Structure formats: structure tokens, C-alpha cells
Amino acid sequence: INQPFTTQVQFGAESHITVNRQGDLLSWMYLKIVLPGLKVQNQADTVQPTQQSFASLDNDVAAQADVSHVLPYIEGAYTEASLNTKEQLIAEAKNSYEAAKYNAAPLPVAAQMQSTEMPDFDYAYWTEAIGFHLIKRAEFKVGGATIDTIWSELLFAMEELMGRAGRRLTETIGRTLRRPTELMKASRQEQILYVPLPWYFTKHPSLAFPLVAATYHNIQLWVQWAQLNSCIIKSRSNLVVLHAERNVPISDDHLRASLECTYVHLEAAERDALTANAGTQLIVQHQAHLQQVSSNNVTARLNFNFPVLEFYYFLRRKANKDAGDHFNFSGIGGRDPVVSAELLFNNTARVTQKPAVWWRAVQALQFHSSAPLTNIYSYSFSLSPEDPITPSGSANFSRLDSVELALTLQDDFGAAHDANSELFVFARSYNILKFTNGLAG
């Protein structure tokens, strides 16, 4: 059953829905998002050219940030050089930078000159995985208490690690695996996205949320929406972005969303048994530590609580965020942003210093259904952190005085044009949801 929001849905706003009681249990939950098709027009041809600024490919802030790190390695008259000569000098300076920083062997200049064949026409498109990016934060509330919180960055990390082969969310969230031409094609028409909300009760039928056992509590989904300026990328800085059908400038009121819920109807005997004794459900809750990065050495103090199953972490460059590439967790020149990490409990090494590949590939190989295609790192205390019903290990962070994740990042990470890069750390923790006398807590 599809249900409208109780408040208006708009870009950059917060909206909520009170979930209807149309069955005995609540199972699957999808945010149904409708995005308009995009068109572009020159600002000179527009009767009202005043719109929010969007990221533009003629002003690639990520490429400019990467060039800024190699400027000290450019030999010769860069300022006066022809465009083709500047591209050669930048590719040679990249070899000199990478030799000096990483002892890398030089790549042939022709192999570094990847022309992305960008189309010779004007366009705008919705950013990669727009269905996740739109959901800056969602909160599942029962009786006014927040039971769990999910973030855009966590949803993406969860799909990277737990997304099964042949069941990746690609079309359902507007994800193309960084193929700009496919984002452009999709963005020319109306898009309907079905973003799964991975709450504890959506993971297994025995965890379905017992609506009948919580009769005296309102169930609410709250969603904080992304700002419109962050959702769109355009070919050129001087273009106005239009709603393709309405032929008006795109505005914050053009976001449409509804909640699609799967209800379970029970036989009277099972319904009555569940109403009399729903008892307790084991739940997984999410916790977040969000930090700005301005140095190559970063210590994150993880003030998480409860029995933690696992945590995820990853970095986002300021330049990647400003370019509208919100799920690009790569470092400078697309490298791995982490050199090494260490995990400390009460200043004692729980995991001694390990290289990035161990946290990214070995932890994913041991504990996850998939290896991440992006620079997402994980660590599990659980033997099976994807099993929603069988506890298989945890560390109780409410009994540790300090938990520190110490990171050594790549050289010049968080310097200059990347000042205020972001560190995300998300933890999954066990808690218990109790149902008693028509109340849930």
C-alpha cells in the first residue's frame, strides 16, 4: 500500500508520514520518489534566469583540486602555455608528484589523457544514486521516540557491502556505476525510484513490526531531504535547469515522494496470540560519528553505545562533494584516501595498524555478501553481521572508556582545496524493542 506524506515534500525540507494501520504486521518499506525530467536553456533566453547554483562540468572543482596538488611539480611556463601543452605539463607533473610521494613508476602520458567522450550538447542530470542522496536522514519513530536513524552515506555503504549480486539497487535508486551518459539519458524524463529503507523489521519475516502489539503508539517516518542545488549537475555554468514537462525553472516544490509499505494480514488466532504476547524483538540500531578532516593524521573518538556488531568508515573529499559526486569516496587522483588504520580500546590496540586494503577487501571478504567498488572500509566483531536474528559476536562500547579509530591518510589529504573533507563512521548495535499492553519502547 502506497501512502502520501502527512506534510509537504520539498527539497531541503523535513517531511513526515504517520504510517497507516492497514494490517497486523509491517514488513517491507520503500520510499517511492518521483523526480521530474530535466531540460536546459541558456540563461540569456530565460525570462527569469534567477535559480540556485548547480555543479557544472565546465567548472570541475574536483579536477581543479587535483591539479592544485601537482602545481609544485610543473616544470616550465605553465601560465603562458597552450591548452594542449597545459594538459601535457599536468600529466608529466602527475608522474613527478606520484614518483615523489609514492615511488610510482611513470605512466605513459597518452594513458593518463583519458578523454571522457562528453556529448557536444547541453544537458543536466540528477546526481549518481540520487535515490540515496535525496535521503540526508530518515528516522523511524514509535510513540514519539526515535527507534532508529539512517543516513544517505550509510544507505550507500550498506548497499556496497550487503548488496547481493543480481539484486543491486541500481535502477531503483538511480545508480549507473559512474556512467554520466546513462544519468543524462535517465534525467531527460520523469523517474520513479523505489528506495528500500533497511530497518530491522525489513530484514527477516520474524522481525516484522507488530502493529497490533503497538496499538497506542503512532508509527512515523521522518525524512530530511537533500537541497536541490546538490541534486543536479549541468554541462555548463550559464545554463538554467527546467522541469522538462512544465517548462519552468526547477524549484524545491518539484520533489514528490510517498511511502510504500507491505502489510501482513494474519489469521485471527495468530493475531490474537501476537496481541496478547508480542514480547521482545532483537533490533539493530545505527549510530554515526561525523567529523571534518584537515590533516593526514585523524583520530576519531567513537562515542557509540551498546553491543556494536560492526562499523563502517569512509572519507569524502570536499572537492568531490562540491563537484556533486556525493558517493565518490576516493582520494586525490582517484587513489585510496586511507594508507592505514588502527583501532584502540582504552589506549590498547584492539586491531594494530593495518593497510587500507585489509579494512576494505579482507573485512568485506570475511563478513559481507559483497566487496565495495568504492573506498568503504569495515570491521566486524560479529561472525555474521548480516544475520538479523542470530547474534554472532559484538563489542559493548557502553563499557569502554575510549574507542579510537586512528587513521593515516594519503599525503595532502585535507590540505588546501580539500580543507574540511569529511570522515563518516557508522556503527551497527544490538538493542531490544519491547512490546507490552499495546505500547512499544
Binding site: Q43, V47, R137, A145, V248
Partner: protein, 663 residues
């Protein structure tokens, strides 16, 4: 009970985040808000709400006249395209065929006349202009012919018969008293009135659609909506297409695209330092210079020139730039260093741009001189700009989106009611010196009736003007007596303002297509030229009431209701007094920062408040607010909202709050 002072700097409007020291982060404490040191830093007008939207009359042009609707039949599935063409405000007659044996004349037009809607759904062909008599205000002529030897002629629309898309039949007897000679080669103009409102335009489009489709404009919403009318049972609306008019009416969720925009500078307008009414008037009159004003500049030779700009309406920044360029080059006499002055639109903008002054050699703009024109008209700071060959304005200026203002506005606050009034000035006729007459076109230099100096006329291609013999000089005129060209017609002489591709657009040079008369005998003499003054509509919305007008100053602040307010005489008055005073600020917690806070204070919407900050520091201390926290608190977020629900603007001011916690 420890008291803690929390200090924060707002990074966003309306939101402050506070970190609780770990010594106090125990479970289940009540926090009493004791005091807030509030900065009162919010401006009367902020950069987030500084727009006013207005329009004059809607002109129908060849590029903006048509709406097409694709209809699908419900039974057959057949597709029928339905075209509404609105009649042009001015359409040229290119031929007049003489009398068939019945005494009918055929008038052939340059553009499709649009007077007859095609018969559809078993309806007869409908005369669209015949409906103007019921839609327009009483006394508005639905149709005028220009170029009669006797002057302009009002013709009853019901006397026209359809011939084809480019020509109409009329009985010679209907027009006999007035048709005595169209001149050899200029057959005159068909003129229809400009639309005072979007609502009147929608009624004409509905009539041109034979009421098969209904267009309605909702003034409270500022939205045009389209509905199936008489075809509702037989057809479904599949799609809508058309020219710039269809896009303007329907392309923006029904919001009309032809609103002119003014941006007010952010500031304090409640303390009498800044006059909001004068600022609105100055921003509406951006291309009108009240008095002759001087541009002072110096060349490489060290010689200083003063350039006197003509007073009047330039209409567009390009006409102003070109006038400045022309006058600088005439005054400097120096063919070796031509000054170039242009208005340049910003990349991706159709209507925002900057003035750019360029020469081959370095020159100085003496904009810090008190005898110089206010440089803010050109988007420059009032300082001397020296030692460069190129100067570009710091501030972005708005060019007109569709048609430059034909009116000049006064904006004033009505004494004793404190209501804002946006009123057009009395439009003064201009005197035109006859320079020449050729091919039905009269060439005129426009002059100020009081001083006799050149005057910028503000008129544009397709403007309809009335021509009279030179009127007596106004009382207190200082200029020399002008020799008037005398002409007589039975009716008013009207003319259509035409472009001339061969003459530089001096804003004081006016070219008018006029009836064939002895105008060549008037070369060197003067005539008086008058044009009709337009209505005004103003669109104002409070924050969040409309998605398109979201950056509007707010209807309630200016004493307006949310929606469109129209003044048929070019005068709009607010319903209520202007209220620019600082308002109370509601302080609440951001939802999801806490699982349960109890408060004793609620706003009118039932939202839980911590406290309400008074309008100013003099109204008293901020009321104490008791808050109970059910959980251990590491951080909390406060929301600060204006009474309209908009976020409070801290303008980089810091805020400090004192909370007492229970033990």
C-alpha cells in the same frame, strides 16, 4: 544545580547547535532556560527575501500569441489538435483590395490576423475580437484601424467576415466615412488593446478555444490552470504546446513567466535610515533618469570631459549604454580612441548583467565626483575608477524580461493609514521635432516640454501613440517657444512606433508609422506625442506560500494579502498598514535531537516552544523556559523561527544562553 553558559555561532538560518559538557551528560535531567543574550541581528529585508514581482499590461506579439492543445477522442482514439491564436496588439496591413461587385474590401495583414477561431466540435467559426467588448473595461475599443485620412477609426468587430488566415472582409459602407485614402504603399495598422490582467487574457484564450478548453487564472495563487470545458465528455487533454505565450502561462506550474523582478538591498528599513518606499520606486524606475545628469571622465591626455545625459526613460540598459557611448564619443571628438559602452548579460542569465566601459587607451571614470550621475544606476561604486582601459560594474543589474516599463512609479506610505501605495506618475507627453518623413514613417527627435532639451521617450516597437499639434508649454516652462506643425483630422491621429534598422537607437530618436499627410511641410517644426499609460499588477507572497515567489519580501510586511493585486489605473494600494517592525522569535528544539521534551509553552500551531524572544531588547527580558530531558544529552539543537514560520537570520552574530540543570 550548576548553571552553564552556552555560546554558539549560527552557520545556518534558524538553527544553532550546542555541545553539553561530559560532566552534565547524565540521564534524566530538567534544564531551565534562565536567559538568552539575543543578538537582534536579523534585517528588515534579508538577501533571502528581497524580491518584488510586478507587471504592466500584456502585449500580444508574433512570438507570444498561440496555445495549442492535443485532444484525444475517448471513443475512436483519434487525435485532434486545437489551436488558439490571440489577435496581435499591432498588425500591419500590407494590401487593401478594391471592391468586389458587392462593395466589400479585403484587408490583407502582415501576420495571421487571429480574429476567427476555427469551428470545432460542431460549433461555428467564432469571432474572438467580438468577445473583447465583454472582457475589457467599459470604453476600451476592441479594435482600431490606424492610417485613415480622417484619423484613427474604431470598427465594430462584428462587421469583419473571415476570408483566410491573413485577410478579412469588411463592407466598404461600414468604413466609408473614414477610408478616404490609405496612402500609396502604407496601408496602416490593425490595433487591439493590451491585456490589463492574466485573467482577461485567459478569458480570451478560453473564447479562442470555443470554450472546449477553459483557462482560469487564480489571483490568490498567482496560477493559471487549464481544464476541459465543452469537450470534457468526448475528449481527453493529451498535451499542451504553443509559442512563448503557452510557455509563459503554463510552463511554470501555471505561474506567469512575464513578471518583472526588482531586488531590494538587504538592510534595516524600520529605523528611518533607509526608506523602503523610495528604494522600491528607485528599483522600479531603474532605467528612468529624472533630471539631466552628467558623466565625468578623463582621457590619457589628462583632459576631463563632462557628458550630459538626457533625462527620461531609456527603457533598456542597452539603450542607456548606447546613449552614453554615443555622447562620450561626440564630446571627446577623438576618432583615435573610440569609447565603447555596453551592457553584458551574465552567462546562463537572460536578464541579469553588468555595464562595461572599454577604450583602446587608459581612461578614468570620475564617479566619486558629486556632479556625476549616481553610479549605482550603472552598477558602479561612487568612487573614481582610474588607470585602466576597461571597467566593469561591481553590481549585477536586471534588464527587463519582456517589455520595459512604460510607466514611471512613485511609491509612498499613505499618511494616517501607513498603507504602501505604488502609483504611476502622471505620464507627461513629449514634444517631437520632425526630422523627416518617408515611406509612411515619421522620424522625430523627442524633447522635454519644459526645458526643450533632448528627452528619452521610453517607447518601444509596437507601442501605439497619439499625435497632436504642439500643445501649449506647461506652466513654468524655461525653454524657448517651439514652432508647432499644425494638422487637422476628424478623429485622433494615432501611430505605431516602428524600429528603424538604419538609424542608431538613440533613446531620444522616435520613429512612428503615421497616416499619409503633408508631414514633409512640418520638417523642423514640433508635434506633441502621447502614449497610453499601463495598469500595474503586483505579486507578493509570504515565505512558503508560493514556491515561485519564495524570495519575495512578504505580502504581510508590505500590508498586502498573498497573491496578485491589480491597479487598473496604474495604482495599487496595500490592504493593511506596512509592518517592518522586528517580530517575536519562537525558540524550539529540532525534532529527532530528543525522544521526549515536555514544555508548558506552545505556539498557535500547537508546536512546543522553549521560549519566545521579544521583538526588541526594550520589550523586556526573554521569558524563562522549563525543559525536561528524558535522556543523557551530549548535544542539542535549537530552532529559531519568525512568526511567519521563516528561519531567523543571525547574520554571523553569536548567541549565548544560560541553562540551569537539576542535580
Amino acid at each position: 544545580m550548576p548553571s552553564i553558559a552556552f555560546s554558539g555561532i549560527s552557520t545556518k538560518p534558524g538553527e544553532l547547535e550546542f555541545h553539553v559538557p561530559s560532566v552534565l551528560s547524565k540521564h534524566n535531567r530538567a534544564g531551565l532556560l534562565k536567559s538568552i543574550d539575543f543578538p537582534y541581528s536579523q534585517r528588515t529585508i534579508e538577501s533571502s527575501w528581497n524580491k518584488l514581482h510586478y507587471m504592466e499590461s500584456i502585449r500580444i506579439t508574433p512570438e507570444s500569441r498561440s496555445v495549442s492543445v492535443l485532444l484525444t477522442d475517448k471513443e475512436s482514439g483519434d487525435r485532434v489538435e486545437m489551436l488558439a491564436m490571440v489577435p496581435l496588439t499591432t498588425n500591419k496591413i500590407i494590401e487593401i483590395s478594391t471592391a468586389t461587385t458587392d462593395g466589400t474590401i479585403i484587408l490583407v495583414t502582415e501576420e495571421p490576423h487571429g480574429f476567427f477561431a476555427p469551428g470545432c466540435f460542431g460549433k461555428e467559426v467564432r469571432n474572438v475580437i467580438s468577445s473583447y467588448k465583454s472582457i475589457f473595461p467599459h470604453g476600451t475599443p476592441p479594435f482600431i484601424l490606424i492610417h485613415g485620412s480622417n484619423g484613427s477609426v474604431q470598427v465594430d468587430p462584428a462587421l469583419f467576415e473571415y476570408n483566410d488566415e491573413y485577410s478579412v472582409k469588411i463592407k466598404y459602407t461600414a468604413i466609408r466615412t473614414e477610408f478616404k485614402l490609405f496612402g500609396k504603399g502604407d496601408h496602416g495598422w490593425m490595433v487591439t488593446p493590451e491585456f490589463p490582467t492574466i485573467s482577461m487574457l485567459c478569458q480570451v484564450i478560453t473564447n479562442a478555444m470555443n470554450s472546449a478548453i477553459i483557462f482560469n487564472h487564480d489571483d490568490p495563487a498567482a496560477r493559471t490552470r487549464m481544464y476541459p470545458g465543452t469537450c470534457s465528455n468526448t475528449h481527453v487533454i493529451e498535451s499542451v504546446s504553443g509559442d512563448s505565450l503557452a510557455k509563459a502561462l503554463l510552463g511554470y506550474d501555471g505561474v506567469y513567466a512575464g513578471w518583472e523582478e526588482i531586488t531590494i538591498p538587504a538592510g534595516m528599513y524600520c529605523y528611518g535610515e533607509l526608506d523602503l518606499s523610495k528604494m522600491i520606486a528607485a528599483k522600479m524606475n531603474r532605467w528612468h533618469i529624472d533630471r539631466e545628469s552628467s558623466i565625468i571622465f578623463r582621457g590619457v591626455s589628462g583632459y576631463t570631459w563632462n557628458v550630459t545625459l538626457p533625462s527620461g526613460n531609456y527603457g533598456t540598459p542597452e539603450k542607456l549604454a548606447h546613449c552614453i557611448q554615443h555622447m562620450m564619443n561626440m564630446t571627446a571628438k577623438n576618432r583615435k580612441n573610440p569609447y565603447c559602452v555596453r551592457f553584458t548579460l551574465n552567462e546562463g542569465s537572460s536578464h541579469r548583467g553588468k555595464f562595461v566601459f572599454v577604450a583602446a587607451e587608459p581612461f578614468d571614470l570620475l564617479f566619486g565626483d558629486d556632479e556625476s550621475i549616481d553610479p549605482s544606476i550603472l552598477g558602479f561604486e561612487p568612487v573614481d575608477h582610474i588607470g585602466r582601459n576597461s571597467y566593469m560594474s561591481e553590481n549585477d543589474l536586471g534588464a527587463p524580461l519582456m517589455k520595459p516599463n512604460c510607466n514611471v512609479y512613485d511609491v509612498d506610505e499613505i499618511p494616517g493609514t501607513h498603507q504602501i501605495r505604488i502609483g504611476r506618475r502622471t505620464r507627461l507627453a513629449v514634444d517631437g521635432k520632425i526630422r523627416g518623413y518617408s515611406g509612411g514613417t515619421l522620424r522625430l527627435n523627442t524633447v522635454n516640454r519644459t526645458t526643450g532639451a533632448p528627452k528619452c521617450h521610453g517607447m518601444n516597437k509596437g507601442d501605439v501613440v497619439t499625435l497632436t499639434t504642439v500643445m501649449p508649454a506647461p506652466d513654468g516652462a524655461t525653454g524657448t517657444k517651439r514652432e508647432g506643425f499644425t494638422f487637422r483630422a476628424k478623429n485622433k491621429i494615432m501611430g505605431v512606433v516602428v524600429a528603424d534598422e538604419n538609424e542608431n537607437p538613440d533613446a531620444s530618436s522616435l520613429h512612428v508609422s503615421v497616416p499619409s499627410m503633408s508631414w514633409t511641410l512640418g520638417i523642423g517644426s514640433y508635434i506633441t506625442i502621447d502614449s497610453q499609460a499601463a495598469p500595474i499588477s503586483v505579486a507578493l507572497f509570504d515565505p512558503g506560500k508560493n514556491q515561485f515567489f519564495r524570495d519575495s519580501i512578504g505580502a504581510s510586511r508590505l500590508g498586502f494579502s498573498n497573491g496578485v493585486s491589480t491597479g487598473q489605473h496604474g495604482v495599487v494600494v496595500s490592504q493593511c498598514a506596512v509592518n517592518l517592525e522586528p517580530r517575536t522569535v519562537d525558540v524550539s528544539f529540532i525534532e529527532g535531537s530528543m525522544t521526549s521534551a515536555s514544555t508548558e509553552m506552545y505556539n498557535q500551531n500547537g508546536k512546543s516552544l522553549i521560549t519566545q524572544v521579544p521583538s526588541d531588547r526594550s520589550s523586556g527580558p526573554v521569558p524563562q523556559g522549563m525543559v525536561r530531558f528524558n535522556n543523557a544529552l551530549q548535544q542539542f539543537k535549537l530552532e529559531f523561527t519568525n512568526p511567519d514560520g521563516s528561519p531567523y537570520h543571525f547574520n554571523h552574530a553569536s548567541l549565548s544562553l544560560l541553562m540551569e540543570f537539576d542535580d
